[PDB]
Every structure is written in C-alpha cells, then in structure tokens.
C-alpha cells in the first residue's frame, strides 16, 4: 500500500493531502492515510517520530505536510513528487 502522512482537513485543511488521497484512487492504487493532528492543535509525536525515522531526519526544517511513500517502502515526496511519480 501506499502510505501517506498529514492532516485530517476536517480538523486542519490540507489541500494537498486530499489532492494526494484522490490521485491514489484514480489511479487505483490502495493507501493507508496516517493523520498526524488526531485534534486540533495537538500532534501525535509518536507519529511525527516515525514519520522522521522513516525519512532520515533529524531537523524539521521545511517538512510540509502529505509525505507520501511508495508500495516498497521508499519516499516519493509531497503530492507534486506523487503528480510526477505516475508519469
């Protein structure tokens, strides 16, 4: 499956993210979709630890939200990456 990262955008609007989660289903292509922000202003930092683990970070530093990783696992990006990624 294809897992992506972000915001439930009821809770914080993400724009992005809702794009990423529909492309996926065009394309048919199941996901499993993690919210990072479980209620408004307050984060899941188990998540955003695994989220950084996952990405081999160390800083937070221009992070935005969807991540977006492939089937076998490797990062593809946000969801221009993933525009990219089906072409």
Do not use: W
Not at 1 to 25: E, Q, W
Request: net charge neutral.
């Amino acid at each position: 499956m294809f897992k992506v990262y972000g915001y439930d955008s009821n809770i914080h609007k993400c724009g992005p993210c809702d794009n990423a989660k529909r492309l996926l289903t065009v394309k048919k292509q199941p996901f499993e979709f993690i919210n990072i922000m479980p209620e408004k202003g307050v984060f899941d930092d188990e998540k955003i630890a695994e989220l950084l683990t996952k990405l081999g970070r160390d800083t937070q530093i221009g992070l935005t939200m969807p991540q977006v990783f492939a089937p076998d696992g490797s990062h593809i990006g946000g969801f221009d990456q993933l525009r990219e990624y089906f072409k």
